[PDB]
Amino acid sequence: QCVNLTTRTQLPPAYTNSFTRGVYYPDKVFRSSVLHSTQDLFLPFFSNVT
Amino acid sequence: NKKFLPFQQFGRDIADTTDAVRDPQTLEILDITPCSFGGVSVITPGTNTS
Amino acid sequence: GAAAYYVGYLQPRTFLLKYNENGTITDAVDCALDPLSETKCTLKSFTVE
Amino acid sequence: KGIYQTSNFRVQPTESIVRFPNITNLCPFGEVFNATRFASVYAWNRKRI
Ligand SMILES: *[C@@H]1O[C@H](CO)[C@@H](O[C@@H]2O[C@H](CO)[C@@H](O)[C@H](O)[C@H]2NC(C)=O)[C@H](O)[C@H]1NC(C)=O
Ligand SMILES: *[C@@H]1O[C@H](CO)[C@@H](O[C@@H]2O[C@H](CO)[C@@H](O)[C@H](O)[C@H]2NC(C)=O)[C@H](O)[C@H]1NC(C)=O
Ligand SMILES: *[C@@H]1O[C@H](CO)[C@@H](O)[C@H](O)[C@H]1NC(C)=O
Ligand SMILES: *[C@@H]1O[C@H](CO)[C@@H](O)[C@H](O)[C@H]1NC(C)=O
Numbered sequence: 001q002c003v004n005l006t007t008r009t010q011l012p013p014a015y016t017n018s019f020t021r022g023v024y025y026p027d028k029v030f031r032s033s034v035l036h037s038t039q040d041l042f043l044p045f046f047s048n049v050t
Numbered sequence: 051n052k053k054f055l056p057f058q059q060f061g062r063d064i065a066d067t068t069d070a071v072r073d074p075q076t077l078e079i080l081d082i083t084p085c086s087f088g089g090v091s092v093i094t095p096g097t098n099t100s
Numbered sequence: 101g102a103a104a105y106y107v108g109y110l111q112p113r114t115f116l117l118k119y120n121e122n123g124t125i126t127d128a129v130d131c132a133l134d135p136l137s138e139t140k141c142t143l144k145s146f147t148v149e
Numbered sequence: 150k151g152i153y154q155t156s157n158f159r160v161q162p163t164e165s166i167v168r169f170p171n172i173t174n175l176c177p178f179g180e181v182f183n184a185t186r187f188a189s190v191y192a193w194n195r196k197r198i
């Protein structure tokens with residue numbers, strides 16, 4: 001049983017910059033002193049994040 | 051001396067060849083180095099004389 | 101209380117990653133931010149002369 | 150007469166070794182392939198081995 005917490009539907013959301021965040025390890029292999037190019041669903045740098 | 055993270059098993063170099071491997075029984079990291087190395091040249095004075 | 105959360109959206113992009121001596125990821129480059137970032141991504145070097 | 154380059158110095162393997170994890174139990178071949186009732190195609194079942 002849940003009783004509605006808020007009546008206000010939405011407020012105008014404001015966004016900040018995600019400076020160089022959200023980088024994840026693409027594979028489970030170890031690399032040292034290596035510059036590696038990989039394609040995946042990464043988060044764009046300097047993006048708009050709510 | 052390489053320290054693999056718990057989720058990693060193999061290691062690869064810039065040429066994508068396997069370089070470090072974790073022993074699945076003793077959990078120690080080992081490096082793989084090729085067996086062939088070094089140049090060889092032969093000096094002959096001609097097969098018609100010696 | 102006092103809590104804040106942030107949501108961003110992923111997108112198919114190519115990255116170039118700097119791997120440390122101990123195996124950590126210390127830096128990365130977005131290859132589509134600007135022409136400078138693209139030329140870094142193609143030249144495989146974090147410094148462009 | 151002259152000096153000629155040949156193949157690089159080769160060392161032949163002397164032994165062969167195998168390193169597999171210490172595993173003793175046998176895989177559930179009798180409850181995956183030999184089950185009494187299978188799942189429907191629209192609600193197929195997925196099992197971890
Ligand atoms: C497979 O066998 C090896 C060797 O018998 C096991 O290595 C043992 O690891 C434990 C964990 O610290 C040590 O206390 C023992 O001394 C090791 N054995 C020997 C003979 O030194 C290994 O653990 C086994 N694999 C698994 C998954 O248990
Ligand atoms: C799958 O289950 C059947 C049972 O219906 C197994 O068949 C029996 O297997 C035992 C062990 O080999 C034999 O002694 C019996 O004679 C078999 N029954 C018949 C009617 O022949 C079968 O072995 C099982 N298969 C697996 C891979 O576990
Ligand atoms: C509030 O919760 C009640 C509980 O039944 C529900 O009937 C009502 O639709 C809710 N108000 C909304 C969704 O605006
Ligand atoms: C995010 O979008 C707003 C407009 O909705 C814009 O004003 C702001 O500059 C954007 N942030 C960026 C581009 O980092």
Ligand SMILES: *[C@@H]1O[C@H](CO)[C@@H](O)[C@H](O)[C@H]1NC(C)=O
Binds near residue numbers: 098099
């Ligand atoms: C080299 O050997 C061949 C055959 O043995 C001979 O015909 C030739 O004269 C030799 N060359 C010299 C310079 O002696």
